């Protein structure tokens, strides 16, 4: 039938035109609305203390500049570098915290709409004892707008940030 | 848990190392195996007379060189140009025939594994009366290997290529 999502267009030029809109905490912009593939560009600098626990995979292609992913691989606080030109496929549920410090950076991130009842988690870990401080689960509907309200609630509440092993109150900063 | 799909790596350099393997009819190479996102690069020159009827969306990013998509939009034999640097999201079921004439071209194509019972179609249309000549449906398991055997069967059989409106026998060439 129709091309619902429009005609091909130049991506470098699209990124240039929307550069001034790539803004924190999360830094992104969705290219097409109501699609099954969720196609965003993420710039910087961003502010993220959360780990994301995505029930599906996440494709990355660091188009401009560099960034890294803080991970928890196999229990250990780990890092994956998104050097300019790198690509990478995250397995479902690997906890990850995108750090994007470079102004003018641009990373293509691709995900899919989540079916009903498949939940996304956002977690924070204690920077002293390294144990789970807080975890919210959300039925995700916008990878752009549903994020910061969630982090504000954590940021605004030392009961959420108080650790349950040590009593260290996470800075959320 | 583990990074099942490995660590980030440089995509331009990966494409360079596998250039000599991007070979017709279809021209592709999957970057990761057993993933839900099916991430391929497609080079050229390719030989495609089929239209693909994908039950899911297809993301394109023409990385090197140019290509086009022959389409059937709203009944009309149409074209979408994949100019170097273009991106594009195909809606599910839009019939499309990727033409990739340029040696050394490279296009990122992203799709997802198809659930059980969601079928892919490959169709051919009559180049005289413009009506459907032949359509096979397949449970797709490899976007790389399941293709040409299907086209050989059409190519090898004038009963499949004989049109049911006119009697024009499609060249399959
Ligand atoms: N992985 C991300 C996500 O799931 C949402 C928003 C941004 C990112 C990112 O990688 O920057
Ligand atoms: N759309 C394609 C597909 O579905 C399989 C293989 C190649 C392509 C292509 O766009 O070249
Ligand atoms: Fe994420
Ligand atoms: Fe702690
Ligand atoms: Fe296709
Ligand atoms: Fe015909």
Q: Can you offer a commentary on this structure?
A:
Chains A, B: Fe cation 2 binds at residues 126, 129, 163, 166. Chains A, B: Substrate binds at residues 58, 100, 111. Chains A, B: Catalyzes the oxidative ring opening of 3-hydroxyanthranilate to 2-amino-3-carboxymuconate semialdehyde, which spontaneously cyclizes to quinolinate. The structure is a homodimer of 173-residue chains. With 173 residues, chain A is mainly beta. The first copy, chain A, is 11% helix and 37% strand. In chain A, strands 2-3-10-5-8 form a five-stranded antiparallel β-sheet, with no helix packed on it. A three-stranded antiparallel β-sheet of chain A has the order 4-11-12, with no helix packed on it. Chain A has a three-stranded antiparallel β-sheet with strand order 7-6-9, with no helix packed on it. In chain A, strand 2 and strand 3 (37-42) form a beta hairpin. Chain A is globular, with a radius of gyration of 17 Å. The A-B interface holds A 1-5, 7-14, 31-32, 35-37, 39, 56-57, 59-62, 71, 73-74, 80-83, 85-94, 108, 110, 112 and B 1-5, 7-14, 31-32, 35-37, 39, 56-57, 59-62, 71, 73-74, 80-83, 85-94, 108, 110, 112. Residues 126, 128-129, 131, 163, 165-166, 168 of chain B line the site of one fe (ii) ion. The site of one 3-hydroxyanthranilic acid has 9 residues of chain B, from loops.
